[PDB]
């Protein structure tokens with residue numbers, strides 16, 4: 001009806017159809033702290049919100065008032081709660097309310113309350129048919145919006161809409177192969193469909209990753225994905241890996257490739273490999289190169305790894321003090 | 324040596340730490356490059372102006388900013404009308420770190436205001452007459468503990484508080500943030516924090532909670548908001564800190580976690596990013612770096628012998644440099660990054676992070692690193708609660724005098 005930004009907007013204390021209600025001023029006490037100097041519009045809307053809340057008035061006019069209270073501060077969860085009471089109690093058309101929430105999210109997409117409201121609506125209606133497309137539109141303006149990806153995961157899981165997501169992931173990796181949210185969605189989809197035990201699938205996933213690392217050697221997301229999908233069975237379980245990485249040293253090196261090498265050696269020394277000592281010193285060398293030269297921001301971390309490996313894998317590590 | 328630059332960010336090798344985009348441009352790299360250019364100007368400004376760098380924490384300016392805010396705010400803070408205990412907490416904690424005492428009439432006025440925010444059925448709301456919610460509940464309790472008087476302690480209705488917590492508890496181990504609200508890892512932390520401080524933890528309050536949190540750790544090593552989600556500094560801090568309170572750190576893979584957070588420090592900027600391939604931000608000086616003291620304490624209890632005895636496992640020098648050179652507003656207050664505007668949230672967490680980076684401690688061992696002038700040194704902070712270590716001890720002791728509600 002009367003938008004909060006309309007040039008002909010009028011304060012509630014000047015509206016005839018609200019003449020019967022006494023507004024209810026905020027009770028901040030005799031000497032306030034963190035007291036906010038509200039504007040006129042704001043204080044007027046909330047003085048009237050407190051009045052309807054206090055009387056538990058469940059009317060059409062209170063419903064319209066919550067719209068303004070939300071727009072002044074969409075983080076007000078108390079107002080959101082009252083609004084949901086009125087939706088049920090007045091029997092309001094819930095598709096019309098979906099139209100409403102989709103607009104609010106478009107303009108304020110980083111607010112917790114607006115996403116939770118949409119979820120409740122979908123729950124009430126039991127209808128996920130608008131969701132993937134709506135979320136895609138939000139992600140088209142900020143491809144990393146945390147609430148958006150969370151809502152997307154919830155919808156897919158609750159309603160089992162898995163069949164097109166991998167295709168969607170591939171599309172966004174095309175647009176920006178550095179998008180960590182998308183690499184996370186990839187793992188989320190595969191985990192819950194085929195899984196990573198299918199040798200064919202794991203094989204596919206590693207080729208693709210190594211392929212992307214070649215295209216963009218300094219993109220950390222790819223490196224973390226490769227490590228993520230191999231580290232549970234154990235890196236040393238895959239013996240071709242080591243030589244294939246060394247074969248990128250020449251023209252594809254990075255502190256990321258070096259760090260991975262250290263992780264491979266680390267696992268090798270845990271599953272008792274051949275050449276125990278040759279492997280140790282290779283690793284201590286790399287830990288040192290990283291701490292002194294290639295990755296000094298992490299000097300305290302790499303010195304810790306170096307000490308750890310020495311403390312438990314040196315030839316003297318099992319030798320009693322008396323020897 | 325005379326030719327040696329004492330500031331890490333200004334050394335000539337430092338230039339090697341700029342972004343390598345492999346000649347493949349995407350939205351992510353374009354945005355990262357913009358920030359690095361803006362930070363380079365800040366670093367280079369001393370050289371271009373021909374002055375010797377001096378890193379000074381502007382104590383006076385920040386104090387005026389806080390002292391005023393604690394009483395009154397402009398309408399720019401309308402979007403925080405439902406978060407007023409947070410404002411109490413952010414401001415009081417900043418003053419505490421700066422070692423500015425709290426006039427006892429201020430203390431009494433804060434107490435009385437928070438009483439108005441307290442729900443008849445337990446917990447605190449974002450303002451007088453608003454419904455209760457775990458986040459402002461966490462902030463309220465923290466603020467009263469910073470004040471730390473009998474008056475403050477007596478504000479909290481402990482029977483109701485426990486009732487409130489129970490009404491939020493889920494069968495799978497998680498908590499709702501509030502009645503009819505959302506579940507995520509923050510809520511476990513909020514609950515564990517207020518319950519432990521006020522001594523209301525029953526035998527079954529947290530059944531399943533450690534397990535639910537552990538499900539939030541992902542393939543990255545860090546922790547997400549709910550199972551399946553990207554790892555993030557804010558949720559990771561909350562998850563680990565809650566586990567420490569419950570003494571269940573071991574439910575996590577501490578090693579992959581440690582590798583994840585240490586990777587979150589930006590090689591060029593010196594500050595921390597919140598998640599892989601995003602931008603640096605002053606507030607993560609606490610949520611991210613705050614994890615290292617927690618991991619240290621955890622690994623040490625497991626008997627880890629490789630642990631340093633004087634430093635946290637991140638670059639303390641470089642973090643201090645980022646905060647002091649890039650995160651201060653000349654007029655007072657601190658901020659996300661250059662070009663951003665000041666606010667009380669970043670004031671709280673930038674200073675909290677500065678303190679972490681200045682103060683190392685592991686039982687008997689104690690070692691400080693203070694960049695710039697010595698007056699920069701702040702009061703220390705507890706890595707689990709982010710209030711003063713003393714204020715934690717004082718509060719826990721006081722509430723241990725009472726029996727857990729229901730006996």
Ligand SMILES: Cn1cnc(S(=O)(=O)N(CCN(Cc2cncn2C)c2ccc(C#N)cc2)CC2CCN(C(=O)OC(C)(C)C)CC2)c1
Pocket residue numbers: 075076077112405406409449456458459557597604606659666667668669
């Ligand atoms: C990047 N980021 C870091 N923390 C968050 S948050 O956790 O989403 N939220 C901070 C929102 N946020 C934004 C922000 C902070 N750093 C960069 N940005 C863009 C804030 C929040 C408060 C101020 C202030 N003063 C300034 C900025 C912190 C608050 C918001 C909601 N909250 C809360 O209890 O309020 C309600 C219960 C009313 C939702 C507790 C956590 C985002």
Ligand SMILES: CC(C)=CCC/C(C)=C/CC/C(C)=C/COP(=O)(O)OP(=O)(O)O
Pocket residue numbers: 110144145146147458509512513555556557558561596597598601602604610
């Ligand atoms: C106890 C308590 C309430 C703790 C707060 C935990 C915390 C900081 C959570 C972060 C939540 C979030 C949506 C971050 C992403 O925002 P963004 O995408 O704008 O930021 P980013 O790009 O740096 O990830």
Ligand SMILES: [Zn+2]
Pocket residue numbers: 604605606607659669
């Ligand atoms: Zn921030």
